Enzyme design. Structure first.
Site, short mmCIF file in Angstrom:
data_model
loop_
_atom_site.label_atom_id
_atom_site.label_comp_id
_atom_site.label_asym_id
_atom_site.label_seq_id
_atom_site.Cartn_x
_atom_site.Cartn_y
_atom_site.Cartn_z
N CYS A 1 28.79 14.75 42.28
CA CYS A 1 27.05 16.05 42.01
C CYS A 1 28.22 17.03 42.41
O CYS A 1 29.19 17.10 43.44
CB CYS A 1 26.03 15.60 42.28
SG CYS A 1 25.13 16.44 42.65
N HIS B 1 12.70 6.85 27.79
CA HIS B 1 14.25 5.67 27.92
C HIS B 1 14.86 6.21 28.47
O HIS B 1 16.21 5.35 28.12
CB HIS B 1 13.10 4.88 26.64
CG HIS B 1 12.18 4.12 25.70
ND1 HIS B 1 12.12 3.52 24.68
CD2 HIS B 1 11.37 3.75 26.67
CE1 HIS B 1 11.26 3.16 24.73
NE2 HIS B 1 10.45 3.34 26.42
N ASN C 1 3.84 6.43 10.38
CA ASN C 1 4.67 5.55 10.05
C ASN C 1 5.03 4.81 8.63
O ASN C 1 4.20 4.42 7.84
CB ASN C 1 4.76 4.48 11.18
CG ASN C 1 5.62 4.17 11.89
OD1 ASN C 1 6.18 4.55 11.94
ND2 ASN C 1 5.92 2.76 11.99
N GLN D 1 5.64 2.11 8.29
CA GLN D 1 5.56 0.08 8.15
C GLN D 1 4.81 0.49 9.60
O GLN D 1 4.40 1.56 9.67
CB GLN D 1 7.15 -0.11 9.87
CG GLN D 1 8.44 -0.70 9.20
CD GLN D 1 8.66 -1.36 9.97
OE1 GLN D 1 9.00 -1.14 11.16
NE2 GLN D 1 10.08 -2.39 9.37
N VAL E 1 7.93 10.76 7.45
CA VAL E 1 7.59 12.07 8.62
C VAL E 1 7.92 13.56 8.11
O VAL E 1 7.27 13.71 8.42
CB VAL E 1 8.18 11.58 9.88
CG1 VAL E 1 9.22 11.91 9.89
CG2 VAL E 1 7.38 12.47 11.08
N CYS F 1 20.84 13.00 44.56
CA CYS F 1 20.00 14.19 44.86
C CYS F 1 18.70 14.37 43.70
O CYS F 1 17.80 15.18 43.97
CB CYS F 1 20.51 16.01 45.26
SG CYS F 1 21.64 16.48 44.12
N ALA G 1 12.16 6.70 16.84
CA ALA G 1 13.36 6.49 16.71
C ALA G 1 13.39 6.91 14.77
O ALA G 1 14.74 7.28 14.23
CB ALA G 1 13.96 5.07 16.42
N1 AR6 Z 1 12.17 8.98 7.86
C1 AR6 Z 1 10.43 8.38 8.37
N2 AR6 Z 1 9.45 8.72 8.03
C2 AR6 Z 1 8.33 7.99 8.74
N3 AR6 Z 1 8.72 6.29 9.00
C3 AR6 Z 1 10.14 6.71 10.39
C4 AR6 Z 1 11.45 7.04 9.25
N4 AR6 Z 1 11.77 5.83 9.90
C5 AR6 Z 1 11.50 4.89 10.28
N5 AR6 Z 1 10.33 4.87 10.34
C6 AR6 Z 1 9.51 3.86 11.05
O1 AR6 Z 1 9.52 4.70 12.51
C7 AR6 Z 1 9.67 3.23 13.29
C8 AR6 Z 1 10.53 2.90 14.38
O2 AR6 Z 1 10.53 2.22 14.81
P1 AR6 Z 1 10.84 1.27 15.55
O3 AR6 Z 1 12.24 1.30 15.03
O4 AR6 Z 1 10.42 0.19 16.76
O5 AR6 Z 1 11.43 2.85 17.19
P2 AR6 Z 1 10.87 2.82 18.22
O6 AR6 Z 1 11.13 3.88 19.33
O7 AR6 Z 1 9.23 2.36 17.98
O8 AR6 Z 1 11.44 1.54 19.19
C9 AR6 Z 1 10.54 1.93 20.93
C10 AR6 Z 1 12.23 1.43 22.01
O9 AR6 Z 1 12.60 0.21 21.02
C11 AR6 Z 1 14.13 -0.01 21.38
O10 AR6 Z 1 14.38 -1.15 22.34
C12 AR6 Z 1 14.51 1.57 21.69
O11 AR6 Z 1 14.23 0.90 23.11
C13 AR6 Z 1 13.63 2.15 21.67
O12 AR6 Z 1 13.30 3.71 22.49
C14 AR6 Z 1 9.25 2.20 11.99
O13 AR6 Z 1 8.09 1.64 11.88
C15 AR6 Z 1 9.95 2.72 11.00
O14 AR6 Z 1 8.63 1.90 10.06
N1 V7R Z 2 18.72 5.27 17.23
C1 V7R Z 2 19.41 4.25 18.08
C2 V7R Z 2 19.03 5.09 19.03
C3 V7R Z 2 20.67 4.71 20.22
C4 V7R Z 2 20.75 3.52 19.84
S1 V7R Z 2 22.38 2.85 21.18
O1 V7R Z 2 23.17 3.17 21.86
O2 V7R Z 2 22.90 2.33 20.07
N2 V7R Z 2 21.70 1.01 21.77
C5 V7R Z 2 20.23 1.71 22.09
C6 V7R Z 2 20.30 2.71 22.90
C7 V7R Z 2 18.54 2.83 24.21
C8 V7R Z 2 17.87 1.51 24.43
O3 V7R Z 2 17.08 1.50 25.07
C9 V7R Z 2 18.28 0.66 23.62
C10 V7R Z 2 19.67 0.13 23.09
C11 V7R Z 2 21.06 3.10 18.86
C12 V7R Z 2 20.30 3.07 17.83
ZN ZN Z 3 23.10 15.12 43.83
#
Ligand code: AR6
Ligand code: V7R
Ligand code: ZN
Ligand code: AR6
Ligand code: V7R
Ligand code: CL
Ligand code: CL
Ligand code: ZN
Lengths: 277, 282
Positions: free
Chosen positions: B157, B124, B224, B226, B242, B135, B44
Site C-alpha cells: 500500500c 466476484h 439470455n 440459454q 444482448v 486499510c 459473462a
Molecule cells: N451475446 C450474448 N447475448 C446474450 N446472452 C449471452 C450472450 N453470450 C452469452 N450469453 C449467455 O450468458 C449466460 C452467461 O452465464 P454463465 O456463463 O453461467 O456466466 P455467469 O456470469 O452467469 O456466471 C456466474 C459466475 O459463475 C462463474 O463460476 C463465475 O464465477 C461467474 O462470475 C449464458 O446462459 C449464455 O447463454
Molecule cells: N469470462 C471469463 C472471465 C475470467 C476468466 S478466468 O480469469 O480465467 N477464471 C475465472 C476467474 C473468476 C472466478 O470466479 C472463476 C474463474 C475466464 C472467463
Molecule cells: Zn493500506
C-alpha cells in the site's frame, strides 16, 4: 479447407513490444503500405474464424459447431477495423485487401474505392444486368451468387444476386486487379489475422516481396508464408494495432454506427516522422 | 477447485424469432419508461462479443472443461473493449434511467467503460483491482493483478501504510465482499424493475438478487440466449444477443450509445444529463 486448428504462438511481452516498434519503423519508412485482412480481425467482435482453434472449418473437422457471440447486423468493428480507417485517413494506408465477407470494413466507414472484398460482402448484392452494387443494412439472404429475390432500381429491373463466392467461383475481376496492382506497387505489405492459405488471396502479399518490398505477417497461428516474412508478430491484432497507433501518435476514431463511404476523402494531417537511422 | 459445483453447462440456446424479438424489446422499453428504480444484473454473456468466453455457454470455460476441450479467448483482458451493451449501460446511468449495476463479471470492463464505481457492485471481484489487507484501500490498475483467490500480489500500500495488497478474485468458498453485496441487496429490494443481461443466475446469492425485486410487486426481465435458473419468475424473457436487444432498446428510448475514450476509472456518478420526454403509454 487446408490446415485447421494449428497451435497458437505468443511472442513474450518484451519481444512483442520490440516487434511493434519495428513495424512502426517500417510504416514510417514506407511510401506505399497495403494491408491484407482475414477473419482473425473480427474474432474479438464475436465472429469466429475458419482455421483457428475454434474456427468454422476446425470445429467442423472435430464434429463440433462454431459459436457466434453476435449476428452479422449487430457486429461492431474492432479496434483493428477502426485503426485501419484512421491509417487510411492520414495517408499511411494506400489500399486494403480483405478476404472477409462479414461486411465490417464497409460498415466501419472505410472508403470502398480503397478496398477489395475478394470473397464478397454479406450485405452487398449486385445486379447481373448493369453490375450496380447495393450496400444493404441487413445480410443479403443468399450465398453462391444466387438471386436474392430483389430487382434493380436504376433508372433496369435486373436480377440482384449476392456477392458471396462458392468454392469454385473465380474472384471478382475488378477487386482482384486493383488488389494485385496495389500489392505489386507496395513497398510494405502487412497481413492481419489471415493464415494466407487461399489462392490467389493469400499469395498477393508475396507480390510485394518482388523488387525489394517488405512483408509483415501478424497472426496467432503459423501461416502459409511465414518463411517469406521480414517480420512475424504472434499476438492479438488489437494489441498490436493499438500499440502501433500509439507509436504513430494516432487516436483510434469513434464508430458512428453503420456508414458507407464510396470515395476516399482528401488526407488529414498526420504527426511528423521520427529520425530513424 | 476440483469438484466445485459448476451447475448446468452447455444448455441449448433459444432464439426469439424476429417479430417476437421486436415486440419484447418494445415491451422492455415500456417497462423502463414506467419504472422509478431500474437495476441491471450482468454476467459473462455481456462480454462474449468482445472475445471473452462465458462460463456455461456452448463454448463456456466450464462447458468446454466438461467435454475435455479448452475455452478460447480472442482478446487479452487488457486489450478487451467494452461492448455496445457495456456502453449503453454507461449512458443509461448518465441520463438517470439506471439506479444501480450488479455484476458477477471479473473482466474489469464495467470500470474501464467509465461506469461510476459508486453505482457498481462487483460481487466476484475485478481482475484489475487489488485491495490492502490493513486499510482496505483499493487500487484500479491498468494491467491484470497477477493472482486470484485473495492472494498477496507482491505490491504494498502507498497510502500516507505499506499494507499487503491482495487480488479481489473470490475462490469458490470465499463469501462475497460485504459492502458490494449489502448495496446490491438494497438496490435490488428497492428496485421496481430488475433486468438481467447474459447471466444464467445459477450462483447464490448473486443469481438470487434479481428475485428480491419481485417482492412487493417489482417486475423482472431476463435477457439470455440459454435458459436461466429463474426463467419461471420473469415477467419477460428475451432470447437474443444482448447487443441486439440493448441497441434496439436505446433506439426506442431515443438515446445514443456513447464513444469509449479508452480505459478510464470514474469513482463517483456525475449529476444526471438531460433525457428525452416519456411516451404516452396507456
Ligand atoms: N451475446 C450474448 N447475448 C446474450 N446472452 C449471452 C450472450 N453470450 C452469452 N450469453 C449467455 O450468458 C449466460 C452467461 O452465464 P454463465 O456463463 O453461467 O456466466 P455467469 O456470469 O452467469 O456466471 C456466474 C459466475 O459463475 C462463474 O463460476 C463465475 O464465477 C461467474 O462470475 C449464458 O446462459 C449464455 O447463454
Ligand atoms: N469470462 C471469463 C472471465 C475470467 C476468466 S478466468 O480469469 O480465467 N477464471 C475465472 C476467474 C473468476 C472466478 O470466479 C472463476 C474463474 C475466464 C472467463
Ligand atoms: Zn493500506
Ligand atoms: N484476435 C486475433 N489476433 C490475431 N490473429 C488472430 C486472431 N483471431 C484469429 N486469428 C488468426 O487469424 C487467422 C485467420 O485465418 P483463417 O481462419 O484461415 O481465415 P482467413 O481469412 O485466412 O481465411 C480465408 C478464407 O478461407 C475461408 O474459406 C473463407 O473463404 C475465408 O475468406 C488464424 O490463423 C488465426 O490464428
Ligand atoms: N468469419 C465467418 C464469416 C462468414 C461465415 S458463414 O456465413 O457462416 N460461411 C462462409 C460464407 C463465406 C465463404 O467464403 C466461407 C463460408 C463464417 C465465419
Ligand atoms: Cl457446440
Ligand atoms: Cl474462397
Ligand atoms: Zn441493374
Amino acid at each position: 479447407k487446408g490446415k485447421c486448428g494449428l497451435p497458437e504462438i505468443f511472442d513474450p511481452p518484451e519481444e512483442l513490444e520490440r516487434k511493434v516498434w519495428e513495424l512502426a519503423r517500417l510504416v514510417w519508412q514506407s511510401s506505399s503500405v497495403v494491408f491484407h485482412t482475414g477473419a482473425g480481425i473480427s474474432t474479438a467482435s464475436g465472429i469466429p474464424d475458419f482455421r483457428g482453434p475454434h474456427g468454422v472449418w476446425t470445429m467442423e473437422e472435430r464434429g463440433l459447431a462454431p459459436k457466434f457471440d453476435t449476428t452479422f447486423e449487430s457486429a461492431r468493428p474492432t479496434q483493428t477495423h477502426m485503426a485501419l480507417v484512421q491509417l487510411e485517413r492520414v495517408g499511411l494506408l494506400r489500399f486494403l485487401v480483405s478476404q472477409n465477407v462479414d461486411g465490417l470494413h464497409v460498415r466501419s466507414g472505410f472508403p470502398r474505392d480503397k478496398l477489395a472484398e475478394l470473397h464478397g460482402n454479406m450485405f452487398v448484392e449486385e445486379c447481373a444486368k448493369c453490375k450496380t452494387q447495393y450496400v444493404r443494412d441487413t445480410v443479403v439472404g443468399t450465398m453462391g451468387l444466387k438471386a436474392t429475390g430483389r430487382l434493380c432500381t436504376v433508372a433496369c429491373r435486373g436480377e440482384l444476386r449476392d456477392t458471396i463466392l462458392d468454392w469454385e467461383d473465380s474472384l471478382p475481376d475488378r477487386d482482384l486487379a486493383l488488389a494485385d496492382e496495389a500489392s505489386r506497387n507496395a513497398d510494405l505489405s502487412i497481413t492481419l489475422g489471415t493464415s494466407l492459405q487461399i489462392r490467389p488471396s493469400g499469395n498477393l502479399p508475396l507480390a510485394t516481396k518482388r523488387r525489394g518490398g517488405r512483408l509483415v505477417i501478424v497472426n496467432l497461428q503459423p501461416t502459409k508464408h511465414d518463411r517469406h516474412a521480414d517480420l512475424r508478430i504472434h499476438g492479438y491484432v488489437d494489441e498490436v494495432m493499438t500499440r502501433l497507433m500509439k507509436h504513430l501518435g494516432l487516436e483510434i476514431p469513434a464508430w458512428d454506427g453503420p456508414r458507407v463511404l464510396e470515395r476516399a476523402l482528401p488526407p488529414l494531417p498526420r504527426p511528423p516522422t521520427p529520425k530513424l537511422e
